[PDB]
Design a protein around this ligand. Structure first.
Ligand SMILES: [Mg+2]
Length: 746
DNA sequence: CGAGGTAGTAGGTTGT
DNA sequence: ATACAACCTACTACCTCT
């Protein structure tokens, strides 16, 4: 049978219990935060003793070497409390940290060809390797002319069992950084007025956008924010005087820089500031380098295994532990743990006429449902290039009818697919100028005068100073119950030439999107588990600090016959959904379900994007009083865990529908990634409270992922949570009032 | 803003 | 320099599409 595993290596040597100087923490006075206090104590304490190691369990610190130098804290006292050896059986948590320390220790001393060490080790989970490993294991440094060091970055997660045996779960990813401090850029003369910056010395924050340069040197007094302290004297008086301990006289006369951060202004030192390195900045500064590293940053599963294997080999033998070393291959299975491997049978979609062999052929089978006939449509073209607009309109039109491509053709597209308008002398398409947001809103208001205009098509110019009207057009047509299908000007310039067929993959999407932006639905599931009558998902998107927008989407049937969505009325200011918002959402959804089908549903299943930290007792009370059985499932999509398929001695990307399951806890891959260049990112699936069995839940989630109506390509997310994510991405352009049969966000 | 996914970068919100 | 862990959000490069 089929199988696969995690990227993790067996630990060979069985562990050995060992001794510890154990310190107790007794507080004296008031402490604002218990945990900040404990960890500050640990860090300062180990910093005084030649950077020796300390490991925290609860409120007790443990060390293996003696901490002779103990500093005084006014808010907390450290008491000695003897010396004890810790049993492995009950202190897995501590021995894991010990193992991470000894891994950092084993890797610290490694030096490569270049005379300085290979790995950047901070004795944390994260270990940066200075040289990235190429496809043929060439082990070459990669660094463009202007800084832009690229480095592999290994996250360690070792797990210690109650018995001695250990397993080492491993992960890795890329990282961009620069050596050139902003002071160097000021010497070399490169403008620095607006670049995003990262403060190296303090690791304070990001979003440190430079506001302006300062004429005052950093030598001048009061240059630091703190009263009567110079910027150079600031670091001197702080415990970190080693940042400026010995400075050049030119450094003292080096000009300050002042940066506005988060709508606040701060004074920072040039020598302490390195520019933030993001793919946009990389692209605009060094175009060729981003392309060069493109193949590198995305890693095939076998490539992953090769890099991780080099890492583990470099760890080698840990003499400090009982000759602990890690095996050179993944586990073939994880069946020794509760996990079972499997592959999900692909779901069967239904076209209008019958079973569809492939998504791209749903046009032969017909869309499952089509609205009332001849819903008009009109276009808006910018003044400059209207010709394009005409060229696209007919093309779109010819697609809905028999004549899909430039030459009328039924040989890959069906005839009379969807009942749409004809763009006649009523609701005409007209020109509009650019450069005025208010005038954009004004043109979209002009749209209101034309009676029964139906869905709208606009052409937007490619972006600068244009301030593209996607958002104002979206908003004005969102106030009214008017759907919109803005289209790129460049995608329009495509359609004039008859050179290629690639237009179809464009059209496929557009058409689908268009049919989805009306009540029409392209396809359905033949065979679903079927116990559930109604599916619901929700997610919260937050654009600004302390502003949370919930959102919800619903299927009123297992098969996915009808999709609806409820945008909330008011914000939340917190990830945990407010109970009032829950009342609102479920009131509206259940009322709309009662109206359409007659009454409330028998039982229901819900998908929460994040953790379902919602009060579960409110759910239980609500539904029990309505006599509704329900299941709560969380669909977590930003995990660092990757998953690999093992066949014999080979490791590849898992096919679409690969799943691993433990009781109520599972991983699933919902995408199809070629084994060539990338590796799919799965998503955690958990069931906090529910009645439906796990396998059925997983099959439903995979199905809902594949039913994505917006395009042929299956959505990685399930429809339930994915549409909530779309809503959250564009909250303002979506009609908030009530559930609407048509879909605005696609 | 054809669509979708992987990859960086930065910040946030919960519950131990 | 230092509160951690898990999970979110936003933005943008790239790349490909019977
Ligand atoms: Mg759309």
């Amino acid at each position: 049978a089929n199988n696969l595993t995690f990227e993790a290596f067996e630990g060979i040597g069985q562990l050995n219990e060992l001794n510890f100087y154990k310190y107790r923490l007794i507080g004296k006075g008031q402490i604002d935060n218990v945990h900040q206090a404990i960890w500050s104590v640990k860090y300062k304490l180990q910093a005084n003793n030649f950077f020796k190691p300390v490991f925290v369990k609860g409120e007790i610190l443990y060390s293996l070497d003696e901490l002779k130098v103990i500093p005084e804290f006014e808010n907390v006292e450290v008491i000695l409390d003897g010396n004890i050896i810790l049993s492995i059986s009950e202190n897995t948590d501590i021995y894991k940290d010990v193992i991470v320390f000894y891994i950092n220790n084993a890797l610290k001393n490694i030096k490569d060809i270049t005379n300085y060490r290979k790995y950047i080790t901070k004795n944390t989970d994260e270990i940066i390797c200075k040289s990235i490993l190429t496809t043929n294991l060439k082990y070459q440094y990669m660094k463009s002319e202007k800084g832009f060091k690229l480095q592999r970055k290994f996250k360690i997660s070792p797990v210690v069992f109650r018995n001695g045996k250990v397993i080492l779960y491993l992960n890795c990813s890329s990282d961009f950084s620069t050596d050139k401090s902003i002071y160097e850029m000021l010497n070399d003369g490169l403008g620095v007025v607006g670049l995003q910056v990262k403060n190296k010395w303090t690791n304070a924050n990001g979003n440190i956008f430079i506001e302006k340069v300062l004429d005052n040197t950093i030598s001048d007094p009061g240059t630091s924010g703190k009263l009567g302290q110079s910027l150079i004297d600031y670091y001197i008086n702080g415990n970190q005087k080693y940042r400026v301990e010995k400075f050049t006289d030119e450094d003292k006369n080096a000009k300050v820089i002042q940066a506005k951060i988060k709508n606040k202004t701060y004074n920072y030192i040039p020598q302490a500031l390195t520019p933030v390195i993001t793919r946009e900045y990389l692209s605009h500064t060094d175009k060729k380098f981003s392309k060069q590293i493109e193949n590198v940053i995305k890693m095939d599963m076998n490539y992953r295994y090769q890099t991780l294997k080099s890492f583990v080999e470099d760890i080698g033998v840990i003499k400090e532990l009982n000759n602990l070393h890690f095996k050179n291959q993944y586990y073939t299975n994880f069946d020794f743990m509760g996990f079972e491997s499997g592959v999900l049978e692909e779901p069967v979609l239904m076209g209008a006429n019958g079973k569809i062999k492939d998504k791209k052929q749903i046009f032969i089978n017909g869309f499952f449902k089509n609205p009332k006939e001849n819903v008009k449509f009109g276009v808006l073209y910018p003044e400059g290039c209207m010709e394009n607009a005409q060229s696209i309109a007919r093309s779109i039109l010819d697609f809905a009818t028999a004549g899909k491509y430039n030459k009328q053709e039924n040989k890959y597209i069906s005839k009379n697919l969807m009942n749409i308008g004809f763009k006649p002398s009523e609701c005409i398409f007209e020109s509009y100028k650019l450069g005025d947001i208010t005038e954009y809103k004004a043109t979209a208001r002009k749209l209101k005068e034309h009676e029964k205009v139906g869905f709208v098509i606009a052409v937007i110019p490619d972006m600068l100073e244009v301030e593209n009207p996607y958002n104002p057009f979206k908003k004005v047509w969102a106030k009214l119950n008017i759907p919109s299908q803005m289209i790129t000007l460049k995608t329009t310039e495509k359609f004039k030439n008859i050179v290629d067929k690639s237009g179809l993959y464009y059209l496929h999407n557009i058409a689908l999107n268009i049919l989805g932006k009306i009540g029409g639905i392209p396809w359905i599931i033949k065979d679903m588990p079927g116990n559930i009558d109604c599916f619901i998902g929700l997610a919260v998107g937050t654009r600004e600090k302390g502003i949370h927008f919930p959102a919800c989407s619903v299927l009123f049937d297992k098969y996915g016959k009808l999709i609806n969505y409820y945008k909330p009325t008011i914000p939340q200011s917190g990830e945990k959904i407010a109970e009032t918002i829950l009342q609102e959402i479920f009131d509206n959804v259940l009322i709309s379900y009662k109206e359409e089908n007659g009454e409330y549903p028998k039982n229901i299943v819900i998908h929460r994007a994040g953790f379902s930290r919602e009060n579960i007792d409110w759910y239980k009370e609500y539904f029990d009083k309505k006599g509704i059985k329900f299941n709560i499932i969380e669909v977590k999509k930003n995990i660092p865990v990757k998953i690999a398929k093992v066949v014999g001695s080979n490791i590849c990307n898992p096919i679409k529908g690969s799943y691993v399951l433990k009781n109520d806890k599972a991983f699933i891959v919902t995408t199809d990634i070629k084994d060539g260049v990338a590796s799919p990112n799965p998503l955690k699936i958990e069931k906090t409270y529910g009645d439906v069995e796990m396998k059925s839940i997983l099959e439903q989630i995979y199905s809902l992922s594949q039913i994505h109506v917006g395009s042929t390509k299956s959505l990685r997310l399930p429809i339930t949570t994915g549409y909530a994510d779309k809503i959250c991405k564009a909250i303002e352009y979506i009609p908030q009032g009530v559930v609407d049969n048509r879909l605005f966000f696609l």
